[PDB]
Design a protein around this ligand. Structure first.
Ligand SMILES: *[C@@H]1O[C@H](CO)[C@@H](O)[C@H](O)[C@H]1NC(C)=O
Ligand SMILES: *[C@@H]1O[C@H](CO)[C@@H](O)[C@H](O)[C@H]1NC(C)=O
Ligand SMILES: *[C@@H]1O[C@H](CO)[C@@H](O)[C@H](O)[C@H]1NC(C)=O
Ligand SMILES: *[C@@H]1O[C@H](CO)[C@@H](O)[C@H](O)[C@H]1NC(C)=O
Lengths: 214, 163, 220, 220
């Protein structure tokens, strides 16, 4: 087994930057057989460079593979707003194979602070005995941050999972929505619902304070 | 030309990482002096001493530089300076080490190693080049390339690719 | 060109087995290595194994060997994959992919790379049965707002506000394989506070196997 | 020198599975077309599909699909037949086949048709349990006589008369499949009516599933 291990992190580059990736493996693939696979979520993962050197008819020339032996290389000179996705490479050498680890390239604006909000649980689901306290992190950059809820003066981890959108191409920022599940009888008790969010832009953990009643 | 003939075959792996150290072009292109002037002379002299000696040397070089091309033709190696064969290293009794041969042994000492059985190897090579390989290739066409592959008796193709 | 119209996504009881199809169209069903790949819904990609229909050469998986079955039936010109022991960690998208060839066609020398592909369907096992959820006004210069499509079955729903008239500034959030046997979803947009009573923000949801598409008020 | 080493006989139930083997002692085995052909007693060679051990190329007979399990092994020099989900009509001699070779040798071009065989393996699939043979002698112008062996299960019975001395008139029959699935046999020894009194005529029946070697001297 050849554990293919590409290793740049988030390729947070500006539109128009040289998208150079690490693109290595555990050991050397036989006969340099590597294919280059662009991928978008929900679409077809598409071949770029077959044999890691030659490109088919129809694939754009700005895709360009290089390297040999154990670790290959992909460079992309111009960064278009549609190529900002996750990139992999995959061996067709030894009879067993695995794909790339995952490198996301994005639109790069500067670092920023959000407009934080939290939703109280709605009465329409509270009358069924199902509370849901939902935070919101609107128009922040970068995506990577941390969310520490204070539900009755305590840390929560296991009920408030996180749903985070990718970089919306209009505003070039991200959006987070953490959602904790609860019931109505606990909603009659809990007064503190304050997600203490930490970020480059959220240096101090702020709240949008509300209690049981609004 | 001949520039590392005294080196070991590992340092004469250097020779065949270049044009066998220029041996073949020195075979045919050292003719260029007697190619440049067997004819620049405009003199009568009524008789010729070199008219037999130079001519005998010339056609001797030509027949020697064609016997080897025909012998590479007879082992399917025509054109290729370095080619491999289906003849195995047989019961031939100079069985020894790989890291002894291609690291510490010159070409001349290697010729002194296998000075015997060399005509045995030369007779042996064309056997696997022809008597079954040419007959397998003659088999390989008297079957449709894309029509036999339905039988599930596809090994014949596999048999022709392993043995 | 080469079209690989995969069969649709499926729901099924866990612990049982599963079959999927991949009907090719164009090029050649045989003489080129059709194969099969995975990707967990959020992970990178993963190759499993393939088949070559003219000689039924099966090149199977390093780990899933013994539980995978790939066939090739050229007489009706399809290709099936049969996995077993359905489970929440068999949940991945399963793309069917064919090897491409040199030149613009489907007959010349192959390349060794997964050039032409198929649409793919997420092969996700089902725990519960269907469920129509309820949609809520999530109360907050700029008033935040959401329509929580929470604890339903099955995935997915979409969210469009005022029948898609409000189109910019949208921020949906993906459905979750959560810890209740159901599925939840969130979706927010950005409106001002002063236009609460003037413009009534009415999200529209589309849950197609549970059949609930209601207009829902947001007037916090 | 392609020689084939099978396994030993077995008694089983329907629905279970039997791993019978064919170890290739000698001969180029990994690249040649093995076949697994059984023969029910007195009928045609029932082909159950072969295998090439080089890339696991299982040419299947299209009538035993789903019930077959055919693999290969180069290290043990053995292809494995695994007839899962057995039936009582599987009672057959599980021969293992392998194609020949042009020549003049055992390494050249293959010919397709099977040349080499194993020792033959028998399955006796029945839910009746193992029994021991009970012989019952026929009492003696001549008047022939034998020994009725019965109440043995499974097959076979190996009768002996005078420890193999009287070798004429030992009409050796196959055991007939009786009404209750049982079997019977009588090697009826023909002797004249001049020595009906004293001379030894013993029926020694050995049955290796039972390991009972019954001795029985006949008497008028
Ligand atoms: C001669 O042999 C020595 C080994 O001691 C080596 O270093 C040197 O390169 C050789 N010379 C040539 C011309 O190959
Ligand atoms: C081959 O020969 C070298 C000496 O030239 C020696 O060091 C090495 O151990 C030999 N290898 C074997 C396998 O005999
Ligand atoms: C290796 O080569 C050197 C010089 O070429 C020689 O002196 C030495 O004896 C050689 N050793 C062997 C084991 O061939
Ligand atoms: C090689 O052939 C010659 C013939 O000239 C012979 O004398 C010698 O013994 C042979 N064997 C060797 C050098 O091992």
């Amino acid at each position: 087994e050849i554990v293919l291990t590409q290793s740049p992190g988030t390729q947070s580059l500006s539109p128009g930057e040289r998208a150079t990736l690490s693109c290595r493996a555990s050991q050397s693939v036989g006969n340099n057989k590597l294919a280059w696979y662009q991928q978008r979520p929900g679409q077809a993962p598409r071949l770029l460079i077959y044999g890691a050197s030659s490109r088919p008819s129809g694939v754009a020339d700005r895709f360009s593979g290089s390297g040999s032996g154990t670790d290959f290389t992909l460079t992309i000179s111009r960064l278009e707003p549609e190529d900002f996705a996750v990139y992999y490479c995959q061996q067709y050498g030894q009879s067993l194979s695995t794909f790339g680890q995952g490198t996301k390239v994005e639109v790069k604006r500067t670092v920023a602070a959000p407009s934080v909000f939290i939703f109280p649980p709605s009465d329409e689901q509270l009358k069924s005995g199902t509370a849901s306290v939902v935070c919101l992190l609107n128009n922040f950059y970068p995506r990577e941050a941390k969310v520490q809820w204070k539900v009755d003066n305590a840390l929560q981890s296991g009920n408030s999972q996180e749903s985070v959108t990718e970089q919306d191409s209009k505003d070039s920022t991200y959006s987070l929505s953490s959602t904790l599940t609860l019931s109505k009888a606990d909603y009659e008790k809990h007064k503190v619902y304050a997600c203490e969010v930490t970020h480059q832009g959220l240096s101090s953990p702020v709240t949008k304070s509300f209690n049981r009643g609004e | 030309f001949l520039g590392a003939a005294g080196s070991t075959m590992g340092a004469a792996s250097m020779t065949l990482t270049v044009q066998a150290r220029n041996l073949l072009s020195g075979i045919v292109q050292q003719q260029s002096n007697l190619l440049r002037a067997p004819e620049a002379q405009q003199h009568l002299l009524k008789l010729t001493v070199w008219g037999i000696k130079q001519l005998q040397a010339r056609v001797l070089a030509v027949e020697r530089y064609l016997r080897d091309q025909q012998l590479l033709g007879i082992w399917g190696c025509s054109g290729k300076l370095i080619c491999c064969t289906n003849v195995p290293w047989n019961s031939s009794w100079s069985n020894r080490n790989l890291s002894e041969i291609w690291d510490n042994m010159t070409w001349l000492q290697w010729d002194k190693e296998i000075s015997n059985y060399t005509q045995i190897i030369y007779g042996l090579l064309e056997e696997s080049q022809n008597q079954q390989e040419k007959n397998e290739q003659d088999l390989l066409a008297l079957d449709k390339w894309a029509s036999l592959w339905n039988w599930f008796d596809i090994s014949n193709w596999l048999w022709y690719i392993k043995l | 060109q080469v079209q690989l119209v995969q069969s649709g996504a499926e729901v099924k009881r866990p612990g049982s087995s599963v079959t999927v199809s991949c009907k090719a169209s164009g090029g050649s069903f045989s003489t080129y290595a059709l194969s099969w790949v995975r990707q967990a819904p959020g992970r990178g990609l993963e190759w499993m194994g393939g088949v070559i229909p003219l000689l039924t050469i099966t090149n199977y998986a390093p780990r899933f060997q013994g539980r995978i079955t790939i066939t090739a039936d050229r007489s009706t010109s399809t290709a099936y994959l049969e996995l077993n022991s359905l489970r929440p960690e068999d949940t991945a998208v399963y793309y069917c992919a064919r090897e491409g060839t040199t030149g613009w066609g489907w007959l010349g020398k192959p390349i060794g790379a997964f050039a032409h592909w198929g649409q793919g369907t997420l092969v996700t096992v089902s725990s519960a049965s269907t469920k129509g959820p309820s949609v809520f006004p999530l109360a907050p210069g700029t008033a935040a707002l959401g329509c929580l499509v929470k604890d339903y079955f099955p995935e997915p729903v979409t969210v469009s506000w005022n029948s898609g008239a409000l189109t910019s500034g949208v921020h949906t959030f993906p459905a979750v394989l959560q810890s209740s046997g159901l599925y939840s979803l969130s979706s927010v947009v950005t409106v001002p506070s002063s236009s609460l009573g003037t413009q009534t923000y009415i999200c529209n949801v589309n849950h197609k196997p549970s059949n609930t598409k209601v207009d829902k008020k947001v007037e916090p």
